[model samples]
Target chain A: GETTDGVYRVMTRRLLGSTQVGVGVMQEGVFHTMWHVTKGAALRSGEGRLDPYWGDVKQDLVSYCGPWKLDAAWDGLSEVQLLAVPPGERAKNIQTLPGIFKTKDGDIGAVALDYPAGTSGSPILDKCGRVIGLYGNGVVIKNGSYVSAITQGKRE
Target chain B: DMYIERAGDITWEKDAEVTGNSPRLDVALDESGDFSLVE
Candidate 1:
């Protein structure tokens, strides 16, 4: 299906070295939604669609900056750089679950963000203040990808 | 141990009637920060 509603319009964006680290898609887009008559079904973005779409499609995680926020959108995000850093660098937010950089400089690569826990819902908005995506879980992605967040989330 | 939840497979259906199947769509982010999707 398709819509002109853009996306879940509260996410965010960022820059990863030479990469565009946040939402980089257009507002008008296409997606695939479950053909349901339910109150909480999830809809996924289509190929080359919107950058940040609803990704809370997992269990025990109606919330994050962690793994529960997985989706195809993330796969596209992982094609950039990566690292298992020695730490120390700049920081980088929102259910409405704000967060800061876990280290001074995050994983020192693309895709991964070193944030605190309980911030999975913290949004990543664009420079234009458009919601691009959210923080995520800790993933040691293979290849040039990682799904886990290098976060120091306060254990719930 | 830090636990990570896999939400990519989470669905809103208690039962599958085909219509309740969580759709997995693909997407792309162009070099210019442009976006598109496969319709």
Candidate 2:
């Protein structure tokens, strides 16, 4: 799916020297919630390229802010949203979940049952619109229910 | 770790493992001024 021009509405940052996309939200004068790497190799060696939404302005690379601790009290019924730019489409909202997942790693993430396959690197947000995770491909089971959709990275 | 790549107007993200069996659908605009699904 391709977006006509709606991707410009939200700020997007490129990663791995322009090979990947990261959706950024401005908070406290810095962009946040863009990390999508999980494995040790990528986390240790990957570098993000600072390409603001605008093409004319040159920006500096921002380092990873480090993984965040999962919210211990996060209920499975909290309202959340998933943001991503699918193939050939502008940045858009994919779906909303009633709650998030607390994986074995003790990380807070989301499990989207209706999320599309092959769509990765999407951002997940809490009810307050703060980025809490990134959309990735994985299956997670909790309390006997199958969860196919998940946020890839840790929280800010 | 996952990886992302771009080709023309399409950006793709690949996970190291299988996530789900859901089909990939693209969102698009219709003549009725609403959003619709595309295969």
Candidate 3:
């Protein structure tokens, strides 16, 4: 993909109005976006391009989430980082999320956290530097800007 | 059904196009280079 930071831009090719601009990552040829982006549509249909996160950025940094479960409750505690690619730039700014409280969400997992900035969040990473989950803005579960736990909530 | 709005001129909304939005390691990943979300 010729990408330096390891993220891609995605869009749901629209025929009626403006296209859906979003981020994308490839795992065995499958592009993953928040269910709210494409709404589970616009894939393998047509007009899917690969923008290698090198061109045409946005005003707000488009973040991400995860669909995998945490193996432990405190595996990558010190290695949490946010893949924040804000406006007017190509290289990604890996920011660290503070005050996390991990918990399981259905199949995967999430964390109660706050963006050191003010509000909002995006894709989260673990100590392994692996992308764990998407950053859904503040959850109803606890107090924080958002959540995407790096591990499960005290699973013994 | 989300009506995502743009704040500036960099229209990345009309540029990048691909299949998935998220990247993961389930059992593991077929490729482990880029970082992405899967839902």
Residue by residue across A23-122, what tens digits does model 1's lDDT show? 1112223221111111122323332222223322321123211122222222222221211111122112111112111222222111344433322333
Writing each residue's lDDT as its tens digit, candidate 1 over B1-39 gives 011111121112222121111112233333332223323
Error of 1 at A40 (Å): 10
TM-score of 3: 0.41
Return the TM-score for candidate 1, rounded to 2 decimals.
0.22
Q: Pick the candidate with the highest lDDT.
A: 2
Q: Highest TM-score, which number?
A: 3
**lDDT by residue (tens digit), candidate 2, A30-58:** 22222232211132112543222211001
Model 2 segments more than 4 A misplaced: A1-75, A98-107, A113-118, A140-156, B1-39
Query: How many clashing pairs in candidate 1?
Result: 43
Model 3 Cα lDDT, one tens digit per residue, B1-39: 222222222112321222211212222111311122332
Please give the C-alpha DockQ score of model 2.
Answer: 0.04
Q: Where's the lowest-lDDT run of ten residues in candidate 1 chain A?
A: A30-39
lDDT of 2 at A154: 31
List lDDT for all candidates, in order.
0.24, 0.34, 0.33
For model 3 the local lDDT of residue A80 reads 48
